[PDB]
Structure 1
């Protein structure tokens, strides 16, 4: 099962899976569901990404997104070899959700092209969410006319989604990997408690993650070819950054672009070759972990048991286990 802040997550448990071949069938099954007690959706669709001939056609088309809204006790799992050209939102008073083994790529909608998005609102905030062994990709291409938004977020949460494990995911060819707190005014995000572990982040730009407020544990992740910034801790947030493998990454551990800085507790990180650093434009305060020195001690017990892969073994371990179609290997 899940390790970390989302450890209690069971999703739809042992309920007999409902096979769903399209995002419409998936949505219909969610809509018919009573909202609690358990629902397991086995997604069997096999989207052919070769059908997308132009990676800049996507942003101007409307988003295709499945919604779990105010419903609990749900597993969404991709069958092996399954592929989705739609995204998933979990919104409001929605709890105990597993999203697993999904391959999600090249989504329509641009700024609206959410891959996996977890969202608090006036009705409540999601909790006990396990985002595990998914493969999420797009393009680094900046399309003509698109603004900064040819695609959008990879694995995102905001407005005080709490108690979440984001584990063994593979996110590549992706500009904005992981949002955690949508703006400096997202005060509900002080509640966020997120464990990011054993994720593969390769050929990506930034937000790996972007953390605003709350507490995080970012351990045993492999970072390679991250071109703008990596872990960006902001607005008083504190990240415990433990036994990750970093290589070919600019600004691996930083705080920038918020009105107030965030902090890190660094230990046992493998720092490989190709680390670069840069200074942000603007007058907002910033910090670069140039010497890998902690700026705050993690202020409380993590309240869970976890086992650490030796940092030097992380690259190989994560390459071996991260993403969809891996039999959920750990």
Structure 2
């Protein structure tokens, strides 16, 4: 199972120990979800192996809706969506988790998502215990120059909690990851871990964090054009043993005045978040101006490599075609 926050609150096992289905179109995936939701046993664990390319053309809605058929007031539980080999591909259509509990998304590539939420994975409406592992997410950067043509890669909103994002590649994209979509503390997610991801050729939001407590360890950040970790409105982020290469422009942000770099407070919200920095390696990345501004450490056990060991592990073992 997952390291970090998805291991808490009872853990995350997804669809393990129930039914197995193989799907190669969005119609099959959506029907499996909805048919189960309408059954006598709606929480029976379900693993869906994805062995074809899921698209707008072969899906009945503009996103893959991991949501109870009785709408977001009701929970949907105990699902894994796992790619087969390098064949689990979502081209132009993303996944949304809404009041979704104990969910694994693993070994899929999701990319060029413009329609729907315009986001590869949206985790929202009070979802909890979600593990996003060994995937690849991308669009274009700079592409056509319109940062909003695509929306997010992995966004968390509306009280999503206990989430681990591990071993993924996020590449070639403008607005990479959100944690909290608005300055409303009562809707903020909390308790997110990011580890062993590759964040490469991105403009910003790595992540944009509002309010939440977040642990980022053993990630490899590379070629990030504007800024990476943006901690806002009382967020606390423990940034531990990560490797950064060519991250941030070094220019002062026109809104907050903060030097654009691997961590800080940028662009907006009425006040800063905080960051605890330990063990990071910064190459050609502005960093001498940084101080730790919180002692925040997460409430769980974990194993952590050095930054340079992590860089090599991420190079070798992140993304698809590794675990399945």
* TM-score normalised per structure 2: 0.85
1:228 match: secondary structure: coil
Distance 1:226 1:247, change over 3 A: same
Q: Distance in 2 between matches of 1:141 and 1:238?
A: 30
Note the C-alpha offset of 1:64.
3.3
Counterpart selection for 2:49 from 23, 37, 42: 42
The offset of 1:63, in angstroms, is 7.8
- Determine helix, strand or coil for the equivalent of 2:105: strand
Q: Deviations over 1:58-92 (max 9, x none)?
A: xxxx9831011131101011111212112100012
Contact 1:46 1:81 in 2 (8 A): no
User: In structure 2, what is the equivalent of residue 26 of structure 1?
Assistant: 29
SS in 1 for 2:187: helix
Q: How far 1:188 sits from its partner (Å)?
A: 2.2
Gaps of at least 5 residues in structure 1 are 49-61, 277-288
Shift of 1:314: 1.8
1:130-169 to 2 correspondences below 5 Å: 130-141=131-142, 143=144, 148-169=147-168
Distance 2:317 2:190 in 1: 26
Runs of 4+ in 1 over 4 A off after TM superposition: none
Please tell me whether the aligned partners of residues 63 and 113 of structure 1 are also in contact (alpha carbons under 8 angstroms).
Answer: no
Report the equivalent of 1:237.
235
Query: Which residue of the partner structure matches residue 249 of structure 1?
Result: 247
Q: Which residue of 1 aligns with 2:224?
A: 226
The answer to whether residue 313 in structure 2 is matched with residue 302 in structure 1 is no
Q: Distance in 2 between matches of 1:220 and 1:159?
A: 27
Q: Secondary structure at the match of 2:302?
A: coil
Deviation at 1:302, TM superposition (A): 2.5
Residue aligning to 2:272:
261
Map 1:1-330 to 2 at 5 A: 1-7=1-7, 8-34=11-37, 35-46=42-53, 64-69=62-67, 70-82=75-87, 83-85=89-91, 86-92=93-99, 94-109=100-115, 112-120=117-125, 125-141=126-142, 143=144, 148-189=147-188, 192-250=190-248, 251-256=261-266, 257-272=268-283, 274-276=284-286, 290-298=288-296, 302-327=298-323
Alpha-carbon distance, 1:114 to partner? 1.3
Q: Determine if contact 1:169/1:322 at 8 Å carries over to the other structure.
A: yes
SS at match of 1:165: strand
- Any idea what SS the aligned residue of 1:308 has? coil
CA RMSD of aligned residues (A): 1.9
**In structure 1, what is the Cα distance between the partners aligned to 2:277 and 2:142?**
33
How many residue pairs align between the two structures? 291
**Paired residue secondary structure (1:130):** strand
Listed one character per residue, the Cα deviations across residues 77-128 of structure 1 (whole Å, up to 9, x for unaligned) are: 1111212112100012x2100000011112232x8311011012xxxx1000
Normalised by the length of structure 1, the TM-score is 0.84
